[PDB]
Structure 1
Amino acid sequence: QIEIVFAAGIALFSVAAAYFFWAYKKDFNSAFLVSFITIISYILMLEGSLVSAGARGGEVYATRWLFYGLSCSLLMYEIARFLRKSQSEIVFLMFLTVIVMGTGGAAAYFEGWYKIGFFVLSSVAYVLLVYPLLTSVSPNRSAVAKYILLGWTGFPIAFLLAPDGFGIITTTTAAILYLLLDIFTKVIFYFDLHRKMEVNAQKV
């Protein structure tokens, strides 16, 4: 069952990486790297060796969150640059991004008060991560808010519902939802904003 979801993820991001490589300039291509890393992550989840038991008889694939530490750092780089954050602020927000994903994987893997403790830690770093973005004085703020509020913030809600958290929804339901969020935050994100982000980076 869930194998079909993972294979869908492998196929979609293989096509996405191929399109992003050929369609964009042969230089630093973050859209290609984000998609290529996501393929690696979906193959490892499909292989099935790093599953763990989750809430209410579900399963957890905690390497998903560890891989987001890399792929979402690339996305935060693009987002913060698009909002013309300073260099030292871009670095800071990339660090918070790694911290959010790393503690989130820990929250998914561990149990009891440790799940709760890690989830809280991750949530604090996350609030500190998105406050400077959502209150940015950049005119690009609105174009960026929709991915932060709908996509990025969709993940902790999904997590709480999934076997990663309380286990209200099944492992396959969570995985489909994670894949939709992945497509929105990693593929649509670039279809939508690639042109504006590219023009912006050339002016700074």
Structure 2
Amino acid sequence: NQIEIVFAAGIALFSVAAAYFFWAYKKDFNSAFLVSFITIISYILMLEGSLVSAGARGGEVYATRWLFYGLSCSLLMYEIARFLRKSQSEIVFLMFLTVIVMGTGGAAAYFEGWYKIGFFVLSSVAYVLLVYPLLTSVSPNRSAVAKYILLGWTGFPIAFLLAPDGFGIITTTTAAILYLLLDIFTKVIFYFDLHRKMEVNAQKVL
């Protein structure tokens, strides 16, 4: 129905994003390229539709989006935590909480009843412990990254609760469109805005 158009739009946008990020940025470790490329793979699988599950109020759930975030958001968390000049051990810790948040989030979306509630509570506890050291960072770059944590990262659990993954108050297509806007904001706009600042900060403490 309309959902294939949402997924097809995500494949095209992140294919353009991955192509730009590779050519425009330095030919070395390119997190921006890897994040968009992983997202392309995730949208193709969601478009194939073999991994769709029943959601709330007659909606559907694509829990593999949450599993692919664990790989792509750990790369984002690496850039974010390094931008705030967290210690190496704190970076490793935050990247683990991110994998935990997405992993339990996919389980919360796929399962039902008290298991959806329990996995959501666990994922939100790990999320609270993930963003607390970032929102209270003494770094001067803290305000520059709070816009992406508060608007983008925290928009997903809210979308989750409204989507068929949670209470199913919005339909599956509306959730996919809102997920896509959140993806563009946290994966593409995030680099258009902060790449050079992150690049300069990284050539000074490495």
Q: If the TM-score is normalised by the length of the shorter chain, which range does it land in?
A: over 0.9
State the Cα deviation string for residues 58-101 of structure 1 (Å, max 9, x = none): 00000000000000000000000000000000000000000000
May I ask how many residue pairs the two structures share in their alignment?
Answer: 204
State the Cα deviation string for residues 25-52 of structure 1 (Å, max 9, x = none): 0000000000000000000000000000
Structure 2 regions of 5+ residues with no counterpart?
none
Give the Cα–Cα distance (whole angstroms) in 1 for the partners of residues 53 and 30 of structure 2. Answer: 34
- Aligned-pair CA distance for 1:187: 0.2
Give the Cα–Cα distance (whole angstroms) in 2 for the partners of residues 41 and 148 of structure 1. Answer: 22
Give the Cα–Cα distance (whole angstroms) in 2 for the partners of residues 105 and 176 of structure 1. Answer: 18
- Aligned-pair CA distance for 1:185: 0.1
Give the Cα–Cα distance (whole angstroms) in 2 for the partners of residues 87 and 31 of structure 1. Answer: 20
Give the Cα–Cα distance (whole angstroms) in 2 for the partners of residues 61 and 97 of structure 1. Answer: 19
Q: Sequence identity, in percent?
A: 100
Give the Cα–Cα distance (whole angstroms) in 2 for the partners of residues 99 and 48 of structure 1. Answer: 25
- Aligned-pair CA distance for 1:186: 0.2
- Aligned-pair CA distance for 1:117: 0.1
Give the Cα–Cα distance (whole angstroms) in 1 for the partners of residues 112 and 164 of structure 2. Answer: 11
Equivalent position SS for 1:138: coil
Residue matched to 2:100: 99
Structure 1 regions of 5+ residues with no counterpart?
none
Equivalent position SS for 2:85: coil
Residue matched to 2:191: 190
Give the Cα–Cα distance (whole angstroms) in 1 for the partners of residues 92 and 79 of structure 2. Answer: 12
Q: Provide the aligned C-alpha RMSD in A.
A: 0.2
Give the Cα–Cα distance (whole angstroms) in 1 for the partners of residues 170 and 197 of structure 2. Answer: 38
Give the Cα–Cα distance (whole angstroms) in 1 for the partners of residues 60 and 123 of structure 2. Answer: 21
Residue 171 (structure 1) aligned with residue 172 (structure 2):
yes
Give the Cα–Cα distance (whole angstroms) in 1 for the partners of residues 62 and 203 of structure 2. Answer: 39
TM-score (norm 2): 0.99
Residue matched to 1:24: 25
Give the Cα–Cα distance (whole angstroms) in 1 for the partners of residues 33 and 128 of structure 2. Answer: 28
State the Cα deviation string for residues 1-21 of structure 1 (Å, max 9, x = none): 100000000000000000000
Give the Cα–Cα distance (whole angstroms) in 1 for the partners of residues 141 and 101 of structure 2. Answer: 24
Give the Cα–Cα distance (whole angstroms) in 2 for the partners of residues 111 and 187 of structure 1. Answer: 32
- Aligned-pair CA distance for 1:189: 0.1
State the Cα deviation string for residues 101-123 of structure 1 (Å, max 9, x = none): 00000000000000000000000
- Aligned-pair CA distance for 1:184: 0.1
- Aligned-pair CA distance for 1:150: 0.1
TM-score (norm 1): 1.00
Equivalent position SS for 2:40: helix
Give the Cα–Cα distance (whole angstroms) in 2 for the partners of residues 38 and 18 of structure 1. Answer: 13
- Aligned-pair CA distance for 1:126: 0.1
After superposing on structure 2, the runs of 4+ consecutive aligned residues of structure 1 that deviate more than 3 Å are none
